[PDB]
Structure 1
């Protein structure tokens, strides 16, 4: 369902999501300009998600249900836990008393990414490269 190389097709409300997370102006602008890909692979029980763009190249590798340390593209040091829950890949990040959730869902031929922090949602839609 999730494995593949995915290209961004649309993005909505991303700047306001970033402001909620606490991202600063200069970083918001560079992140907003980018058109990342998302490359999802598996090796045994270890899942890797990579993203390449003009803003940041990032990579995380993790086991479902196992908390891990992540350094986000905007340089937050977070505690992350990623699970499958109702068929959705659910990524919770916790840092400095705050939490945000990134939901990666498969909907027909798309990978829909909903980034939620409290009342603020950004939706990014990807399709296979």
Structure 2
């Protein structure tokens, strides 16, 4: 099932990402800089219940990091927005993968789904809804 997100990826199109970043208390520096980025994912997994992901973002932020999670298990995360006390948790929702961030008494969400070959992640904080679209490294 999750063998559909697995692979190599690359930014293609984004919209309303900086303002999202603001909704989640990021300084302008990081809202702009973060939107400015063209991140290159490297996604894979083991036993359809433990997904290992990577991110080579790039200029201007230079924050290359990694995810390593079990699906159904809450874990700790330290994003680039500099959030103290992020508690993630990722689920499988039909053909979609739902990544949820808890912090300071709030919840933001990432509904990722493959479509027309692209890894399309919709991002939801309050009334603010962002969208980005990735393509495989011409796989």
Normalising by the residue count of structure 2, what TM-score does the alignment of the two structures yield? Answer: 0.87
Residues 1:34 and 2:37 aligned together = yes
Residue matched to 1:49: 53
Count of aligned positions: 129
Specify the alignment match of 1:79 in structure 2.
87
**Equivalent position SS for 2:80:** coil
Task: Tell me if 1:121 matches 2:124.
Answer: no
Structure 2 unaligned segments of length 5 or more: list them: none
In the alignment, does 2:69 pair up with 1:62? yes
Which of 71-80 and 114-123 deviates more? 71-80
Provide structure 1 residue ranges, at least 5 long, that are not aligned to the other structure. Answer: none
Q: Which runs of 4+ in 1 moved over 4 A?
A: none
Higher normalized strand content (fraction of residues): 1
Answer yes or no: is the 8 Å Cα contact 1:58–1:73 preserved in 2: no
CA displacement at 1:108 relative to structure 2: 2.3
CA RMSD of aligned residues (A): 1.2
